[model samples]
Target chain A: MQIFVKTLTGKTITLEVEPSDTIENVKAKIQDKEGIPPDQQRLIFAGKQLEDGRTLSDYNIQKESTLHLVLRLRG
Target chain B: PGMDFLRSLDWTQVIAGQYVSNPRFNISDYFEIVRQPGDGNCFYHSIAELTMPNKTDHSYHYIKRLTESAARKYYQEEPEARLVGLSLEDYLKRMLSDNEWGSTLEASMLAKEMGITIIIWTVAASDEVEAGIKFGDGDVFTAVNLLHSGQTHFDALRILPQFE
Candidate 1:
């Protein structure tokens, strides 16, 4: 699947992934692309928070679907 | 619809005091504060619209229902800091009660649980508005909330994070 994600800063990017990929793995890849820490990444799709342990298929994240990432800093 | 009087001198004084004490919680850089109704639903009403920015004029019951449902599930999930001086049921009830106040914890959980980014602008006379206590790093379109005057009031904003 080719996922489209838009960041808070309005930066949008596309990523290629399989349904078996865990959100944690996706966050790691996002970190590589965006320089944000993995722990700080909170991705949202279909208005629900993505569980770290869940796979892309678990959340129904599909090809050409758009998701939003909320990178949080521990305060 | 006739609550413009909420912009009182006291509100101004208290907000300025927050900025003065914090010195670094520059909310304007991250969010554009949009005014909410002064009927004491600032906390919920602020986010309701922020959640659906394209819509204007939602009923109090609409937001109340959404908040109550969300708070109930939030408590059930028991994210953390579960004990804030009230039982989870009691705490949620209070939030649903008339003229009740919502806590920063609830707001945070609301965003975290709902997968929506909420950037809260909290103010206080003491160390309430410190950077480490409230603000965080992020690149997300966030619905904003504000806490000020000893957490007496809540205002909301639409965060427009800057990007190149």
Candidate 2:
């Protein structure tokens, strides 16, 4: 399935994820395109977490949905 | 001491009577980082040091009457717990009645239409029994964003034009 991730800098990249792909795996894929590390990536949905071991299907994520990168930090 | 007279007036009557009454003076416009002596890099902190000039055995407001001379002495002794002044003014102005600096709007009307905070701290006689606020001279407010408009003090040349 396809997922879209966007960063605060307005950069967009699409990636394909399989049912076996873990959140950690997805973060790695994003790291390949963006310069963020696994520890630095935080996947948030509806203000909740998609823990490292959770799959997109576990969170009811479907194609055409969006995830945002960790930026626009608050001090 | 047998004399009282009419109140004086000032320009900028806009906020004169209200938002800014009294002398409109406060030093809560600067920052002061209070630390300690020695290599206490990971050492703990106490407000006692921060609130010095305040006597250890007296009420919170029995502070040192700050002046350039005394500040020099205390500062040299304990740079961490330095002595400073926070010039204050009476919240309820007596001399300047409608003399200017107006009323308190309403019972609980502090907000403004123009998004200005009017954020201020009111202080007066230090030794009075709950007669006033306690921010004295030398206590840096460290919160006021007065430097935003390129003016260091209220009486700066830019704001001077706003006044008479």
Candidate 3:
């Protein structure tokens, strides 16, 4: 299925994903597309954060679902 | 009848004057005020609302835990310093429990831990003027701004003019 990832700046990036894919896998895909490291990407869906051990199916995310991406800030 | 009764009142007037501008921070244009619940966790709630995508998430709990841990570490590293009269254990217990209010200690800890500066706008003195106070040791250029009611509440301040 395809999902939409939106940035804080209102930019959206669409990616192909699978329900079985882990949050880490999605973050890796995002890194492949946006050059952001997997560790720096924090994804929020349905008003909850997606954990690395969880899958899209775990969160019940379906096709055309939109997730917000927030970047991790470093000191 | 209830719906019409609700519609009869001008809701805009209810929040009038709450929308304000802070010229000191270069916010010449008016910014929106995001009100938080009056619960004692308003400080943490306001910060979480400003930073997290899920406004209702109990991230404030995590924030409190982090602040407690940071406080412990701070006290450990600076043995000469004291957190008022409360022992470190007592302070940690209060932070973990519900309805416990947060102060500059929690704010500064979260800021340093997250590497983001927290800019708090507050009503100062009897003149009813607003002032911007900063916390955290992170970047000044990219700060999360919040409004602190002088009495006992905190609210999120969105500098950008975005309708919610």
Candidate 4:
């Protein structure tokens, strides 16, 4: 399946993913393409924050679904 | 004296009323305020209005639950976490209940957990707009802006030009 990851600045990155893939896996893939660390990436979909342990299927994320990516700031 | 009259009036209503009438809020120029119900979940509702794709869905329960989990994880990792005189378990229970007002603690936890910034704007006693209180240091894809009446209500703010 294919999905789109949108950054805060309006840049969208397209990726190939599996429904069984966990959010952690998606973050790793995002890191591979965007250089954002897995721990530093937070994904939001349909007003819900995607948890690392949960799979895309668990959240009902479908093909071509767009997820918002926010970078964690160092406190 | 005048102090007695001031004390008699509801500060929340007083400040909330001023937010629109007072030019200092600059509502007509830069921002428009969306009123939220004073159901003790105003803060959560305000954030939802800004972040949710479905405008009508408040998602207060989701935010509350997330805050509870974040608080639990934080305290567990810190070991030295203390909530004044309350135990972590007791605090968590209260936080989980409906109509339980959330404070800056919840705001900070939500911000960190969701990786978004929450900017709370407050009104001073003199009707001046105070500097916004910011939570989270996350990159600014979306920042939830809220208005704090300095008493018991929270309202959402929509930046006029951006309007998103």
| Most lDDT-accurate candidate | 4
Question: How much is A11 displaced in model 1, in angstroms?
Answer: 33
User: Model 4: per-residue lDDT, tens digit, B59-163?
Assistant: 776777777888876644321122223577987887787787765456666666776776555555543553344565431125676776654567788766443
Candidate 1 residue-wise lDDT, B8-55, digit = tens: 111111111111112244455545667666766666666676666464
What 10-residue stretch in candidate 1 chain B is worst by lDDT? Answer: B11-20
Please identify model 3 stretches exceeding 4 Å from their true place.
A1-75, B1-30, B75-83, B124-129, B137-141, B161-164
TM-score of 4: 0.51
Q: Which pairs clash inside model 1?
A: A8-B139, A8-B140
For A1-75, candidate 4 gives per-residue lDDT tens digits of: 999997533478998999999999999999998887775566777655577889999999999998976443221
Per-residue lDDT for A1-75 in model 3, tens only?
899997533368999999999988999999999887875566777545577889999999999998876543221
Ranking by lDDT: 4, 3, 1, 2
Instruction: Tell me the tens digit of each residue's lDDT in model 2 across A1-75.
Output: 888875433356888887567878999998787766665455655445357778887887788667755321100
Docking class for candidate 4: incorrect
Instruction: Give TM-scores of chain A for all candidates.
Output: 0.91, 0.79, 0.93, 0.94
Residue B54 C-alpha lDDT in model 4: 70
Error of 2 at A56 (Å): 0.8
- Docking tier of model 1: it is incorrect
